[PDB]
Design a protein. Sequence first.
Length: 246
Amino acid sequence: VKKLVVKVHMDDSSTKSLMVDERQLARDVLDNLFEKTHCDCNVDWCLYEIYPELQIERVFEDHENVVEVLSDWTRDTENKVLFLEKEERYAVFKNPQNFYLMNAKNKEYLLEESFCGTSIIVPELEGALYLKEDGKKSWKRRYFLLRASGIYYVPKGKTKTSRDLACFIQFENVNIYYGIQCKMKYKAPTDHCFVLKHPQIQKESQYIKYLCCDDARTLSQWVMGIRIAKYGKTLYDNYQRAVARA
């Protein structure tokens, strides 16, 4: 019964307003746009969330309920939905070797082990990243480790062993975003930044976590890796559903 009008922004500055009820997923809105825009229907097409105030942005995952995501938005919000190509969204499924470390046979076997087993296998990703200090234009280099449940950090004066590892954040409690203009705004070492915060946060908060990578490659590895850990088999299912429409 619950209905909502969503203004979807196109790349050429134009907009297309759709009627979206409480039952529609990002998958359904995309199929609707596919018919109306007459696009090539490639897997990179996605819904894209932008927060102009906090200057953060992320892809919608295809299984996400659109109304539910927009219900977190304030009445006076500046937030926009965009329809554009993001080739990073399913990068692991096109080239799994770029993340889990190749021909069609070895690509298939690697993905079936990582996604089609009993539990998911998350890339063995670890490295130092710059974490922003709460409310301060100050950044600190800490060693981080990617796990199935969340990201773990090495406390200053501890070792890499799992017993010494403390949990930084759990993926259940955050969406992952790109950080925009973090270098200029907060004196981030680079602009290769990702942002971890709860869907409900719509303004400045200490619980918005800002992480800066040394290069563009490191950013790509962490965003893809965290999305694998957070979304798991559903992300694989999203991709298979997208290939069938291409």
